Amino acid sequence: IVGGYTCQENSVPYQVSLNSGYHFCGGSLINDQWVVSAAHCYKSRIQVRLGEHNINVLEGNEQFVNAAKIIKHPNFDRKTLNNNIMLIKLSSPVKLNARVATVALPSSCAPAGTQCLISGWGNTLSSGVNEPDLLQCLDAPLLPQADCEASYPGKITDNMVCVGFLEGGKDSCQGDSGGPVVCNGELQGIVSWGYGCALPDNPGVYTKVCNYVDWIQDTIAAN
């Protein structure tokens, strides 16, 4: 998260860190045993970490659970990033408390101009390297499709949405990938791609969750 702020502790209860020796991607908790994240964050062995705040210090509220199943969307396209979404079924169900809590799924799609919350333990700078220890938060709105498509000529699908600022300075970055975009208590996006981080005229491009409610449900009823 470039240009956001440090989230108040345990204030995005549904955020998870995907661990593979170190943090590499975020996701979000949809029920007690399923996490949604991004196909591009696929790894054959993932440990999910919940109730985190400081990613590099054991604080006493974490639950560490292995992925039992890792299911990329059948139409995931690596080249284009189309359908970038994946589901993770945890080896066991977590303990739901004030710090580990689900996030709802959209009842419809949120229109452009809606105000959303974005979070992650991804890069905090436009140029250079800085990985934070504390979870960063970012208030940003969905942008009109028109604006999304002009930024990325012929690069945008019916399942991608841009969230951000055309001016730059405030964005998601590497390490935020698979994490949540939440709009009026609902999971509307998933960090997917962008050119650089927080550059002018290159807003974040996100997976549009509203297009996959049916899939999810389905996937979870079948596994």
Binding site for Ca ion (CB under 5 A): 52, 54, 59
Residue 34 CB contacts under 8 Å (≥ 6 apart), including other chains: 87, 88, 89, 90, 220
Q: Cα separation of 86 and 60, whole Å?
A: 29
**Among the listed residues 166, 169, 195, 196, the single contact to its own copies using CB under 8 A:** 166
Q: How far is the CB of 56 from its own copies (least distance, A)?
A: 17
CA distance 187 to 117: 9
The least CB distance from residue 165 to its own copies, in Å, is: 11
Under 8 Å between Cβ of 208 and 41: no
Let me know: does 195 contact 189? Beta carbons within 8 Å: no
Q: Does 80 bind its own copies (CB under 8 A)?
A: no
**Binding-residue pattern over the window 90 to 109 for its own copies, x denoting contact by CB under 8 A:** -xx-----------------
Q: Which residues pair with 171 in a beta bridge?
A: 2
115 binds its own copies (CB under 8 A): no
101's tokens: 């809590």
From the list its own copies, Ca ion, none, pick the one residue 125 interacts with, judged by a Cβ distance below 5 to 8 Å according to partner type.
none
Q: Judged by CB under 8 A, does residue 11 bind its own copies?
A: no
Angstrom distance (rounded) from CA 178 to CA 187: 12
Size of interface with its own copies, in residues (CB under 8 A): 14
Residue 92 interacts, among its own copies, Ca ion, none and using kind-specific CB cut-offs from 5 to 8 Å, with its own copies
Contact between 217 and its own copies (CB under 8 A)?
A: no
Residue type, 46: I
The candidate with the shortest Cα–Cα distance to 211, out of 191, 182, 188, 186, is 188
82: DSSP letter? B
* For its own copies, the closer CB: 31 or 174: 31
Min CB(13)–Ca ion separation in Å: 14
Select from 150, 200, 218, 223 the one that contacts its own copies (CB under 8 A).
150
Judged by CB under 8 A, does residue 125 bind its own copies? no
Q: Can you list the pairs that 71-74 forms with residues at least 24 positions away whose Cβ atoms lie under 8 Å?
A: 71/219, 71/223, 72/39, 72/42, 73/39, 73/212, 73/215
Cβ proximity to its own copies, 35 vs 135, nearer residue? 35
Query: Residue 57 interacts with its own copies (CB under 8 A)?
Result: no
Three-state DSSP class for residue 26: strand
Query: Binding residues for its own copies, per CB under 8 A?
Result: 45, 64, 66, 68, 91-92, 112-113, 144, 146-147, 150, 166-167
